[PDB]
Copies of this chain bind each other. A is one copy, B any other.
């Protein structure tokens, strides 16, 4: 019943049998005869199909999706963490980080800034992941409170990204919300390759919570078992060298979730500068656009999430592939009325490339011709 990692050799064999040109010729709303993972791999490896042509096909295939875009802004509620992810500044061993924690007042103030000054109706709550059961339950409780508070304020969509979750931890968070509430669980697997995963997230049975690959990857299944709906798997582009392996796994994971009746967003964030203990792979724009294209094409009902990790120039090229645009900063309580968000190296998870205010970024997107759901431009008669 839980997600099972696909056999990469089995998918490769199936991918050899798909007609990539026939696939591209499919009408919007038509599904290939082969599995999505196989089709994605075949499109990826068929270099006779240009990335530019693949991207155009993807944007066309996802064209009828409504709304075209919606948005949420991240709010890191703390930068404490018990884990040791080597590509992340929040790793416990990073003694150089200035550890911060948002209380009731600060979280509420941040929500109110986002709602009224940035004009957004989507928010995401983030924390580190913690080792001992009590801290995990207490974190779930606090984030559950934040989610409930955001919804009561009028936020129309709430994401959370607080590490893997077991059944009792979901129980604690769930007492704050209803089964039909617009709440999305985010748990990026980072890498579906167990060896690369261990290299960056560490070895198990030593008080490093995220090292447990299996607890993490079945978190969505526990979520769905509890009766919820919205999920957000992800791959961190730059960890594993073989992107074809990761796209097969991610598409397979999304496909599993879809089969369970889940609504899934798909995240493929690319690496950003941080206080790392191990360097990573720089993935070029072309490979990355090709990755986004095959995933978006093969999973047309599952929105890709694009964030301000990426510079303005890249957003301009890739926005057509996304279903969710998410501007913001991975610093703790970084927002302030009329000011750009803080992205201090001393306390942030990583350094983002685009620090322009969410309402400017989202305003320019709307001005360019694409409406953004869960964004209410604080302009004209809608201004205070």
Point out residues on A near B: beta carbons under 8 Å.
Answer: 78, 80, 82, 99, 101, 103-105, 128, 130, 132-135, 137-139, 141-142, 144-145, 168, 171-172, 175-176
Q: Which residues of B contact A103 (CB under 8 A)?
A: 137, 141, 144, 171-172, 175
Q: List 20 A-B contacts (CB under 8 A).
A: A80-B132, A80-B133, A80-B134, A101-B133, A101-B134, A101-B137, A103-B171, A103-B172, A104-B172, A104-B175, A104-B176, A105-B175, A128-B134, A130-B134, A135-B138, A138-B138, A138-B139, A138-B141, A141-B142, A142-B142
> Which secondary structure dominates where chain A touches chain B?
helix
> In angstroms, how far is the closest chain B Cβ from the Cβ of A294?
40
A138 touches B132 (CB 8 A): no
> In angstroms, how far is the closest chain B Cβ from the Cβ of A273?
25
Q: Which residues of B contact A142 (CB under 8 A)?
A: 138, 141-142
Q: Which residues of B contact A82 (CB under 8 A)?
A: 132
Nearest B-chain residue to A92, judged by Cβ: B132
A133 touches B175 (CB 8 A): no
Nearest B-chain residue to A171, judged by Cβ: B103
Cα(A80)–Cα(B133), bound, Å: 9
Nearest B-chain residue to A131, judged by Cβ: B132
Cα(A196)–Cα(B142), bound, Å: 37
